[PDB]
Amino acid sequence: CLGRRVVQPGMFADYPPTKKARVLLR
């Protein structure tokens, strides 16, 4: 049906990572 919709799959794919390692020399 017609109406408002939440964010769709695939949109805004460049989200901040949930986890980060601390790498020597980077």
Place this chain on the structure above:
Amino acid sequence: SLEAIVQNASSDNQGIQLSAVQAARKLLSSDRNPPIDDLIKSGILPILVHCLERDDNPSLQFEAAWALTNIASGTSEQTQAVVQSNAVPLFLRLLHSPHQNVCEQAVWALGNIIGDGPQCRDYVISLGVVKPLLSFISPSIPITFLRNVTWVMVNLCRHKDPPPPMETIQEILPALCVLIHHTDVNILVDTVWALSYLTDAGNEQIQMVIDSGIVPHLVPLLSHQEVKVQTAALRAVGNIVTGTDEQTQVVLNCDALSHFPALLTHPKEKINKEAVWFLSNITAGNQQQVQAVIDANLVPMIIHLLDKGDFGTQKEAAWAISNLTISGRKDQVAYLIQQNVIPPFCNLLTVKDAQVVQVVLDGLSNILKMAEDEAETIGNLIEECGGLEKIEQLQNHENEDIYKLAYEIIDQFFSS
């Protein structure tokens, strides 16, 4: 070797301990494929956690926290091994260390842990991480540390099953109101992403964000020079406008639609698609919000993307056109007709995506039912561009709703 490292790290001579822990850290931080499982199975986790307690050797605390950070940056199983070794209370203790680097690395480790998932997040919250975390936001904080703090805030905001406790949101929103004025790109991207995760959590969280007064500072970021900031802001405000007409109007009163010409013509097709999704959520509103879209001179661009855009953008544009018919007035639909919407709107009736077909049929039916005198003219327009043949073909569609709606359309408007 791992056996030697583990043995020397359990020593009571803290120089040998420091050397062994630094060897473990080197193993864990040299490349992007560290041997996490081997070090875990060797029994080094309780040793590192014990090192976290050594307030008399900040170097050992720092190195152990680095090792544990990188262990916790792995799979959920490895992060949970860290958690099961009781590291969280000691990292929270280290948040108050007088040594900056120890504090920073503890923040980083807690960030990985929180980012693992919502139950992990809730455990770390219940122990009281939020207020000490936010206490670091001061004029003298180094920029790298502040970037890490804001990333941890993102992680505190982002999971939805369940969303973070309301008290946590009430504590975090003021800090986000502070940070949204920063000019550093990294901080700004993470701030806006945290906001977007809050505005995707529900209408009540949307209202909490509106009540913070941050929306007038968020909307103008749709025209930031950095595309990452632009798209983060687009996500956050789009989430907001998934809500009620009043919340959508809060967004619109900040002159949001003024930012969309540069997004509808953007070279990146994904941005076109996301912008049209936003606008489709705007056209689903009351007649005033439809008129706001019209007055912003956005309808011709939407129709052009509907005609010529990539399929994804065309799908979003079909949604926008059809949603306009929900509360749109007959004169607004007439404006659409004037702008040559029928040919491409009907062309989209031959795609495999059944949802697009249903949307276009709903829109056409609303258009025809809304027109009393124009109905014959609109029927002629539909027949001229081949849309009527497509509807007749759809009469034999697999989907129940689609073919029932096709039959109804034809019987009420194309059968006299």
